[PDB]
Amino acid sequence: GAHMAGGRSWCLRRVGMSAGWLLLEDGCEVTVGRGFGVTYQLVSKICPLMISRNHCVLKQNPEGQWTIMDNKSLNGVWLNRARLEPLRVYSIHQGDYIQLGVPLENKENAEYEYEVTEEDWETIYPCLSPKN
Amino acid sequence: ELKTERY
């Protein structure tokens, strides 16, 4: 057998932080936004209204591959810098970077940037955002 | 709710 604690999972690792990571739980749909219906509610003090109420959706496709989709967000989703077309489904891979929204004036990076990565559960769990 | 703002 095998302990759950020794497991692995895909996740969105919050760049620059050991907090705010988002779990991509096998077999689940993961929605992200600032509204109250979503799996992970983002709350920004820096710029409350950058992120859309329902900003993006992550889910495995019929082949079992994780994907992301921009849910008609106002300020966009970027996969390695390329702006995603709203509602088109894009496969996401180890090492990909996802940006939600855009950098503010005189800022190098958007607040919400993630690396798509498969990591040990022991690494991920202390860093996860609470579920909404 | 407040609508999202464009940046």
What is the token pair recorded at A13? 């690792």
Q: Where along chain A do its domains lie?
A: 7-132
Method: X-ray
Q: Which of A53, A78, A100, A111 to mutate to test the interface with B (most CBs of B within 10 A)?
A: A53
Residue A73, CA distances (Å) to A64, A66, A111, B5 in order? 25, 20, 16, 11
Q: Which amino acid is at A101?
A: G
Q: Which of A32, A75, A100, A105 to mutate to test the interface with B (most CBs of B within 10 A)?
A: A75
3-state helix, strand, coil in chain A (%, to 5): 10, 35, 55
> Residue A66: beta bridge partners?
A60
Residue A26's CB is within 10 A of a number of other CB atoms, namely 12
In chain A, at which residue ranges do the beta strands (DSSP E only) sit? Answer: 8-14, 22-24, 30-33, 40-41, 56-60, 66-70, 77-79, 82-83, 90-91, 97-100, 112-120
> Residue A79: beta bridge partners?
A82, A98
In CATH terms, is domain A7-132 a member of 2.60.200.20?
Answer: yes
Q: B1: nearest CA in chain A?
A: A35
d(CA A39, CA A75) in angstroms, rounded, equals: 20
**Opening angle at CA A78, ends A15 and A16, nearest 5:** 5
> Residue A92: beta bridge partners?
none
